[PDB]
Structure formats: structure tokens, C-alpha cells
Design a protein around this ligand. Structure first.
Ligand SMILES: [Mg+2]
Ligand SMILES: [Mg+2]
Ligand SMILES: [Mg+2]
Ligand SMILES: [Mg+2]
Lengths: 403, 403, 403, 403
């Protein structure tokens, strides 16, 4: 007997953080942290070749957007929400543009609202980043509302778990500690780039050699290069780290450089994986990325288009026999990837400043947000309506636009 | 507040039709019809080069499987079902094999049960047909149960319609009549094959020229070749029909002939589409099919793997900018393709013996099964729990196995 | 002076084994064995990533089909037969469908009956497995009858041996023992898959290293991976086993994954072979497989289409300078591959539960069925009419259909 | 009960014709005819650009080899034979070389004797022509003996007809007449080459236009260019003949020019076929030829390696979805191609000097050699032991070697 579905009454967007509020706010922006966080400690970037912007990513402006929160209220007064990285500018997009497609549709009209946001912003989105972050947030807000309205987890709507539990590896400066917390592997940032030559390679390879000595042969080790390299540097580094069984090397190149990724994968040591995707948006970009022949694609659910895009990226990887392993986005990834046969493991990105505690991935912004206890999360944990979390409204949410 | 989901208590399979029951039974088998149906009237096939098997497809055995019905009963006693083409042999598969993966899981455990059926039958399925027909049926049975248990249409679970109504073209011997019923186009079978040479081409092209004269320039015309041709014959025919603006030419080759399809598409008249897919199964086969560069892929939802496979095929086509237009499978396609932005139209395959009435696509087996009135179906029509239909149990359902 | 050939009066099919008879029946189904057989001892499969279906393949349903026996009787009352893996469902296919093409033709009309079975089942076979197993059995039944009617071995009909004796390697858990029995090499199953990571690789590589130490440098060692891997896992494993001169690594991927096989072969250690084919059916699939550039194709004569298909696969491999080495199917392979210049060796798959005795490949079902004594079989052994064996009718053959 | 097979006692070779006997002898050499035959009437060749060698092919030496006859006698005194084009030099090869592999083997040892002849002559055969003509003759001689010894047609040994009758088109100067004799089509030689420019094209195209006017639209028309062209000339000519629906254009280029054939096929009018093969020998050459993507390959059974090679070429074409249509070689082709599903028609090459009578294809040399009455040959006609013919020993057979 037919469940009756509400319309959509209001869409609202606030921000915490970024260049118009409290720097260090955390939440949706992973890199809105304080001083002396691991995530800002001399990480190789495109900018790190410049001496002012070598030490800190925060210095070049990695923290200026902050968290976007987008909330959608049905006319039965029930809400759903999600968070992403756009902040005040993303509030403008939701509130001076996108609201015309959200407001007044059914709660179940998610794909249509998605297609309309894609169609309408195509002239100014191009292909990812700020606009697509905003689009993904709306998309996830919508899936939350719908799962709450129905009284079901997103993961059951999507057709159920294919695994009882999600396995995690941990991202950050301390694989040794993450091994003690029960994680399956650990992914470190690179600290030196192309401008540092062989000394850079020696230095980053030595950090891998050390953690192999510490963690032993079965715990996975990976390197994350945040767009900082070229093909030759990436190939010298992949080969330096080969004696230590580096599982994969990740995001070596700026996202436009599809032909670079093709060539990098051709030059990779036998058995070593090349990965990318976290700065890619749209299904069609990921088609192009997949066909470079890289092993694993890594959308951020909050950056790539949303859960709607992500399920399509997973199908596309699976048609090719490839894995999709999203760039860790808490419950949003969780409800997705527990249904994906081609996501055998997931990413926890340490928001703990020294990678010693299981601090929540989206802390403070998300209430009862789960953590990988013993680097695992059981399916029974996610068994809450929608995405299973609530908005910490104690947080100092600014609202620069309404309509 | 969390909806509580039942386990799965029993899976049951019956058959109507095929070589062990009533020939002409209709239902899940499209080609289990009587004498003097359009669908058996001198249609070109792989076999039609043999004089005993030229006149009738029924003669070579196109009707021996019959309908499979698969029903799944939750422990709250609620059921879901679907129908496909496997019959008694499909009953064996469900009841001596597949039941070990269905029975005792949650109603929402569809993808897992899917993966398990794929994994376990891989040594004997290969890649489509009988075993995959059975797999798809179970898969659709499961989605019905789940949508009924939740009290929602499959189409809303999947994230909503992207169109208010499905547009249909009509398949069968009478495009002129289908134009009067309000259909957007009409697809005729070919009647002659390679062994008939130029006379075959002349004859089939003349049937297109005639219906172009009758239907005028805006109503679409297509040809369906049921695996009957080779590349050269298909290219001569595509070129003969070009003056008449044939929209596409469909299934020219046996499904293994990926390289043939590549070559056919290369040789197609400018602007004319090449299509295939209805005898393909598994996501991975469709990856291979897509990369031949054909324009439209055409899974049957009941033959290709199920709704679970189909949503992945749609994502895969959409990553490439291609359409997916399923081989018409009533409500099963409907609830799918009303959510697919890259399915702008759908197929109605005339089960009416002379293509003059809107006889139900799966008649008699499906109760309150919708028809394209004015070659359209509104989204509001599909707004019933699950797939929105019931099993005509008046039908003479035989049960050759239990467990 | 012209030998006069009988028509074909009757085709009959029985079964031993599977989910409707005696589990453990042996015969045509290689994997219809008892408890504590090597062939079910923790073998890596697509399913072995699931904890219920890790330990046993029998648990996921690898044994549910059982043996098909198909017998064809000429009107002079002479018979021929063969066995394969389809059982009761294959009995339906022979007896409610295929009999219309077999019954009433000449005994020498094998290719025609073959083409007709392929043409007629194309809409439900797709490309291999259950239906194709049935087709192959009929095909081999026909060649037996014809060779018996003529009073010649299949191998002489095909144009004679190109070698005095067939050399064998042995498949199963004990290469060391097989070396003592005089076999040229030994092929072990893998036990761990992708979900077991580096520990899985270490474990399987250590089992190869051990048997290299035992068998020494001239006895061949191979690994068989039964569809269980992905490209990366297969490449790590191939490279791990390279120090030990693993001759080849076999069936790493599900049969649809042609592009995976291409990529795997590209990544293989220099000099190491990649093989597949045993789950492929139809000549055209094998064209696609061949062009991935794998080294050896491995049809099962009883699964791929039959002896008629196999001779075409051998020609196709030989045009490319590749070997064909069939997946061991006793006399059916023997009479074939003793004529193939591009099959310099053959497979014996141990049906002996601990790989210590030369138990017959198709035990119990085949009377006076030869064994590789000293891992050889001389051509003079095969010098019997037809395929040279008889049907053990003491076996408890069930007949679920007649016509 | 086992038929007992004789050894091989003697191999003997004679010749009629060529530069050491009676010019105009006919038989195995198609082009050993008299003055004023159609087959020597101003046919375009590689040599026809030279004014001495324009008018006659006989002038440049097309007739110097003559017929080879090779006869093999078993120790039960039974014989088999065949004919080809090598004459006295082919007698040397059989009698000073190849006899070491033929003499003393079993009658059924055909493939082995084949492989041994290929292996041993590889240093001087290269890849076809004179040596391979000799090899093919031996091969066919062997199949005749074996079919006679067994008392069966070659066609039944190979596994039976797939068609009740062979359809023929006719090759030579008079398609109009061949249409009256009941042939399905007619293939004319070209008369002008590249050195004749546009006038050559106009002239040959006008001869096709004329016979289209005469024969009407359903009777097939083809052009045979005997190695005489380049790619550009062949493409201008194919396009000139397109208005008249020329079915195919054949052997435009010298056999080495694989890349030329690739390019020619790319440039062919839509729907028009490109063919070659009659001067190709060995399976491996035909692999290379097939992959140019030409439509039809055309071995001569007596030139390409023999019936043993031809069955492999047919399998190789069929794996690709291509036809094989042998260059007409009477019973040798017949017993082959009546079993080939991918030879839907065959070639009759007019040995009648003005193409008005059904003169035997191998006249005088072959006794009771069938003709396409009404351009057909029924399977029942071929139903004689071996290849079904006898050696006209009235003919003046010279024996230049024994051993
Ligand atoms: Mg990253
Ligand atoms: Mg169709
Ligand atoms: Mg194997
Ligand atoms: Mg020619």
C-alpha cells in the first residue's frame, strides 16, 4: 500500500569557515584545520615549488572556501542535509540559482534535480570543483531527506550491502599508529616535489622504507602526491618505492593531464597501481580518466557530482574490471561503497592533527558520525534513516543569502 | 524512524508454456504465440537459410522454453515476483541452486544476492541466455518484493523519474497502424537474409519505402534483423534504406561478433544508427559491445542480468554519450528507463497478432499491466508499490521442482 | 566401392549426478566428487571472497549439474555416445529441442547438425556454458557413432596422428607425485585470491617454490586460477612465481574480460605464458580471445561446442602461431589433439582425491577409458572405432524426458 | 569392428603439358589451352604493360609448367591421385625429395605427411607457388587414396555436407550465356591495366554495364584483375563499376601487397567486396591476408597447401565472419566446400574456349568429373569413394624421374 511522498518546500544553505568566518572550522573542508596539523605539514603541491607556499598549503589558500551545509525541508517539515567544500560562494549558487530546480519537486525527484543542476551550470561549472562541490552537496542533501522520509538508510535504497563491514586504510603521517588501531594500510603524503630532484625522491622513499620496517610486509603502504609532480618525477619515485612494495601512488598529476596518466601507468613498476580522480567531476571526465588505464578511481562523493554521479562511476569502473575507491567522505561514501562489489576497502583521512586518535572524519559538524573502530565499520552501524547523522547547529553557521 | 525489513523465507518458481506445457502460452516468452502471428511470419534468422526453418521461427524451436515465473516470499508473508524466458530449466536453476543464496537474506540484499548468483553460475552461464534469464528473473522478483515491502515503486527507489512520461515506438509488421495509435515510430522485422542476395535487399527496402510513403517524414522507421546477417549484407541493406531515412538497423549479427559490429558501424550511411544488445548479458559483455562504437545498446531487462545489471549498462552508455534503449520488457523496463536521462524513448513490441490492438506486452501473465495509450505512459501510472502488477494465477502454472 | 551409411533413428539423453540424483557421482562432471577431494580443497574462485563459499566450491553449487550422457542410435541399431556437464537440464535441451535436428539425418551429417544446433539455440545459449555443453555432447555422440559405423577412430577420420604419443602434464595438488608417475609437468590450483592481498600471494608462491625444490628445474610447473583474480593480483602473482620458472598462469579472469587478458599478457614476466579458454564457447569467442594475445587457448571439448568447434579453434591458433591445449577431456581431446601439430602436450586432471593414483579421467562412466601410463598415451591405444569407449550402464542413469 | 588400413608402398608422379611436352594439354593447368581461348584473350596481367606480352599470357610463359599428376599406391594395390600445376619440376620434387615422407606411412597419416612436406621444403618453397602446388597435389592424392581405401567420399570423412547442393557462378567472357546455363553469377577478366589510364577504366566498366543490361539486376557480376593493378587504379575501377552493382573485384594486386589490400578495402565503394587469395599459400599467409579485412579469401586447393590447408583457412575465415570461396578446382574444392557453412557458393572457371558449353573444369585429365548442370551440383553426385574420379591414362603422361 502506497507510501505518500511530500513535496520539497525550502532549500537552505549556510557556511562555517573559510575567508569570511572562523579559520580552523573543520567539518566539510578537510583542510580547514589549525596550525601544526599533519595535513598542512610541508606537503608537496603545485605551489610548493614557491618558497612562500612550500611549508603551508593554508598559506596559498587551501582553506578559503570552508564548509558548505545545504538543508532541504519537505512540507511535512522533515529535513535532510549534507556538507561539502564551497562555503559562501556555494551558498550563492544554491540560493540565487539552484533553488529554482529543487523547490517544489517531489522528495524522490533526485536524478531530475541532478540533471537540471548539471544542465543549467554547464556554462560555468566546467567539469568540477567549486560549482560541482555545490551540486554534489544538494544531491546528497536530497538523498538524506528521501531516506529519512522513507525511514531507510541510503544503502538499502541502493539495493543493500554486499559486505557485512567496510575495511579502511588510514591517510596521514603515521601508518605505524594506524596499524595499531587496526587499519588495513596507511597512505602518506609526499613532502618533496620535482624541484627537489633526487634528494626529494630519496627523502620520500626513505619515509616509506621506514614505515615498511615498522609495519611489516602485510600492512599496505601508499603515497599521495596531490597534483604535485610530472611523469618523470612520478616514475622515478614509483621505482624508488618499489623494493618496499608500495601498493599504489596517487594523484601524481593535475587532473587535466589524462595523457600524462596514460604514460605514467605505462611506466609503473610491475604490480604497482596508479590512481587518481579526487579532483575529477562529471561521469564523462571519469570515462576519459578510466581509459588512461589507471587502476583505481577516487571520486570525492562531495566533489564529483554527488552520490548520483558516484554510482555511475562505480558501474563504469566495474564494466572495466577496475576498482573505485572514493576519497574519504564519511557516511556519504559509506552508504555507497558498502553496496559496491568493486570497492573492497575504503579511505579514512585522519583529521586528528597527529594521527593518534580516531577523531571523526567530518568533526565537529556531524552528530553521531561513525568512526572505523578497529579500522572497520559494520553495516549494522549505518542502519539509520538517510545518511544517519544530524547537523551540529551549535556550530556558528552564517547565512549570507536567502531568496 | 527506522522501517523494519523482513527476511526472505521462500523462493518459488513455476512455468507456463514451452515444450512441456501449452504451446502458445504467451506471457514472459514473447515468441510463445499461436499460428499466424506477425512475430513468426517469415522473419530472417540464422536458421532461415534452411528451407524447413525459413517460414517459422517456431519450427526451429524459438518457443521451447516458455515463461519462467519466480516468486519470493518474505516472512511477513508479503510477496514479489517477475517473469522471463527460461521455463522448466529455469525452475531447476532457481530451485536446485540459486535458492541457497536467496533464502534467508534480507529483502534489501539484492546486489549481494545478484553477485552471488553471478559468481556461482559463472562456470555454466557463460555471458548470457538461459542461465542469465533465470538470474534476471530472480533479480526482478527481488526488486518487486523490496518495493512492495517498502510501499514504493522501483522507479522512486532508483531516485525518481527524469521525464513525466515514457514515449514509445512500436515493433512489428504495421508501422502505419502504430502511427494511428500515437507511437513515435515503428520497427519492422527483416524477412530475407544473405542467402537471398540482392532480391532480399530490394524486398526489405521496398517494405521500408512503402511505410515511409504511408507514415510520412517525421514518424521514425527502423529495421530489426535478429542475428540473421553478415557485415556486407547488413551494409548493402543499410545503404538501400538510406533514401528513406531509416533511423537505425538493429541486431544484424550474432552477439559474439563484436569486430563485425565495429566494422558495420564504420560502413553505416552517415547519420544512420547501428544497434544491438538484446542477446548480450553481463555488464562486461556490454563494455565490449559499447566499445565497438554502436549507437544504442538494447539489453532485455529479463535477459541481460536484471534491473541491477541494467542500471550499470545505462551508466556505462551515459559515460560514453550513448543511449540505452532496452528490448521492451514492460514494467521492468519502465521503472528503470523513466529514471534514465539517456533513454529518451522506449520499445513496445506488439503481441497483438496483426499489430492493430494495444494487447498487453506480457499478456496474459500480468494483472493490471499498463499499455502505451497514445504511445505514451505517464509516470503517475507506474506509481504503484514494486513493479505495480500481480501474477495471473488463473494461468496453468506447473511446478516441476521444490527443495 | 561405396560404404552405405545408416540414417539416425533415435537420440536419447540420461543423467547421473547433480542436485536431482547422487552427489559425488563423478563421470562427465569433474567436480561431482566426494568430501576431501583435492579439487574442492580451498580453491580460489569468484565466490571464495565470501566466507561461506571460501572452503568449498561444492558449497556454492559447482556440482549441481552432474553428468549428461547423450546416445545416438542409427537404424542399423549401432550406437555412439559421449558425456559432458549439464545433466537433467541438458536432457531437456536434447529431448525437447535438439532432437528435431538430429533425428532422421545421415550419420555423417555432423557439421550440419552442429550448425543447426548453434543457429537454433543462439537466442538462449549465449556463447557458452550449459547450452553449449549440451551442444558439444551431441556433437561428440555423433562423431562416436560415425567412427563406429565406419569402423575407424575419430583420429584417423580427422587425417591421422602427427605424433606417436600424447605427452601429459598433471593437474592437481601433487606435482611431486605426478613427476614420479612420469608426467612432464604439474599444474596446481591457487588457494587464495585478491581479498587475501600480499599474504595470498606469498602463500601461493611458496607452494610453487616448494614444488620447484622437490621437482627440480626440468619438470614444468603451472598455476590455475579459476576466474578468481583481477589483473593487478594476477600480475603480482605472476611476478612472485617468476624466480621459480612458472611456465604459465591460467584462467586468472572471468571469460568476458578480454581486455583484462590483453593487459595481463602485456604485464606478464618475460617468457611466462598467460592462458585461458575453458569457459569460452563458440569459434567466434575464441577469435576474440586469441586476439588478446594470450599464449595458449584451452577449450574443453565438452564445453566449447564439441570436436567440430575444437578443430576450428586449433586451425585458428595455428594461423597465429599459438598452441591450443584443451582442458582435459579424455578420449574426446585425445583423438583431436594427436592430429594437431600445435598441441605438443595435453592435460590430465587428477580425479584421484589425493593425486596418487592414475584414476580414470571420466571414472566411473567410461569403459576401457585409457590412462596416461608413464604420463604418455601411444596412438596405438586410441586405435579403436569411434572414441574407443563404452557407457557404463551399471551407473544409475535417470531419464527425465522422452519425446 | 576395426577396419584395417594399408601402408603406403609407392608414390609416382607424371606430367602432361608444359614446355617439355604438348602445349595446349589442358587438365591441371587451367591456362594450358590452345590459341583463341577466352582465358588468353587480352587479359590484364603484371606483364601486359609490355607490348610483346599484352595480347597473350601464353606469350610471357603462363603455360610452361603444365599438369602435375601424383599417384599414391597402397600395398593392397589400391590407388588415389590428384592433379595440379607444376609438371616436370613438380615431378622432381615428389620423386627426389618428398617420397621419403610419403612412402611407408599409413594411408591415414595425411596431416603428418603434410607437416613433414611443409617443414622440409620451408627453405625453398617460400610461402606458395611451384613447391606448394606440388605439396597440395601430394596432399590431395593422399586424401583420395584414404577415401577410396575406406570407401567414402572425402566430404563424408570431413563430417558431411551442410548443403544439399553447391551453387556456382561462372568465370569467363560470357556472363549472358552463363545466365542461360543456370549459374548464379558471372565473373569477367579485366582487359586493361594502369598503363591504359582512364580509357582502360571506361573500357572495362563498359563491359560490365553491357552485361548488367543483358543479365538484369539479380544475376551477380564480378571482375577478376589477376594481379595487374595498383591501389589507385583498382579504386577508380571499383568506383566506375559501382552504378552497375559489381558484387566484388578480385585479385587487384600482387600477393605480397597486404598493405595495399588493406588500403584498397578501405577505399571500396560501400557494399562492394574486395577479394584475393588464389596466389597465397600456407595457413599463416592467409592469417596475414585475412587481417587486411578483405571480404573473401580464395585459395586454390591445388595451390595453397591442399585440402588440409584449406579446411584451416575455412575455419580462420569463419572465426572472422568471412567467406572462403576457393579458386575453382573441381572435385577437390567440391568435397571441401559442401561441408563449409561459410562457402555459400563456388566458382566454375570456363575451360570451354568461348564459354558456351559446360566443358569439364579439368578436361581431359579426369574421368567422370562432374559439371554444374543448371549451375548446381547435388551432394548425391559427389557420393563416390575418395574424390570420385579416375585418371585418364590415355593422356600422354611423361615420367622424367623415378627413385
Ligand atoms: Mg588524495
Ligand atoms: Mg530486436
Ligand atoms: Mg583450468
Ligand atoms: Mg581469379
Amino acid at each position: 500500500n502506497i507510501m505518500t511522498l511530500p513535496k520539497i518546500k525550502h532549500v537552505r544553505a549556510w557556511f562555517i569557515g573559510g575567508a569570511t568566518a572562523e579559520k580552523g572550522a573543520g567539518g566539510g573542508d578537510y583542510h580547514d584545520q589549525g596550525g601544526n596539523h599533519w595535513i598542512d605539514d610541508h606537503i608537496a603541491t603545485p605551489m610548493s615549488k614557491y618558497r612562500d607556499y612550500e611549508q603551508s598549503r593554508q598559506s596559498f589558500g587551501i582553506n578559503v572556501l570552508g564548509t558548505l551545509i545545504v538543508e532541504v525541508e519537505a512540507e511535512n517539515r522533515q529535513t535532510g542535509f549534507a556538507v561539502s567544500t564551497a562555503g559562501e560562494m556555494g551558498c550563492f549558487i544554491v540560493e540565487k540559482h539552484l533553488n529554482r530546480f529543487i523547490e517544489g519537486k517531489c522528495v524522490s525527484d533526485i536524478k531530475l534535480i541532478h540533471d537540471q543542476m548539471l544542465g543549467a551550470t554547464m556554462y560555468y561549472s566546467g567539469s568540477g570543483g567549486l560549482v560541482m562541490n555545490t551540486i554534489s552537496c544538494v544531491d546528497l542533501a536530497l538523498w538524506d531527506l528521501f531516506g529519512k522520509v522513507v525511514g531507510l538508510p541510503v544503502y538499502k535504497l541502493l539495493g543493500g550491502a554486499v559486505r557485512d563491514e567496510i575495511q579502511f586504510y588510514a591517510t596521514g603521517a603515521r601508518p605505524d599508529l594506524a596499524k595499531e588501531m587496526g587499519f588495513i594500510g596507511g597512505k602518506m603524503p609526499t613532502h618533496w616535489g620535482p624541484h627537489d630532484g633526487d634528494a626529494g625522491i630519496r627523502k620520500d622513499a626513505a619515509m616509506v622504507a621506514d614505515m615498511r620496517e615498522k609495519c611489516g610486509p602485510d600492512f599496505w603502504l601508499m603515497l599521495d602526491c596531490w597534483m604535485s609532480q610530472d611523469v618523470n618525477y612520478a616514475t622515478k619515485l614509483a621505482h624508488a618505492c618499489a623494493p618496499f612494495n608500495l601498493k599504489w601512488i596517487e594523484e601524481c598529476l593535475p587532473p587535466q593531464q589524462y595523457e600524462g596518466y596514460r604514460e605514467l601507468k605505462r611506466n609503473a613498476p610491475a604490480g604497482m597501481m596508479v590512481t587518481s580522480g579526487e579532483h575529477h567531476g562529471t561521469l564523462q571526465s571519469f570515462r576519459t580518466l578510466a581509459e588512461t588505464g589507471i587502476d583505481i578511481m577516487q571520486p570525492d562523493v562531495g566533489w564529483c557530482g554527488g552520490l548520483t554521479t558516484l554510482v555511475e562511476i562505480a558501474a563504469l569502473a566495474k564494466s572495466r574490471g577496475q576498482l573505485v575507491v572514493p576519497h574519504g567522505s564519511s557516511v556519504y561514501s559509506h552508504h555507497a561503497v558498502i553496496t559496491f562489489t568493486n570497492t573492497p576497502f575504503s579511505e579514512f583521512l585522519m583529521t586528528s592533527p597527529d594521527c593518534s586518535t580516531l577523531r571523526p572524519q567530518f568533526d565537529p559538524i556531524l552528530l553521531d558520525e561513525p568512526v572505523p573502530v578497529n579500522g572497520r565499520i559494520h553495516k549494522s552501524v549505518l542502519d539509520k534513516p538517510g545518511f544517519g547523522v544530524e547537523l551540529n547547529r551549535d556550530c556558528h553557521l552564517k547565512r549570507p543569502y536567502s531568496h
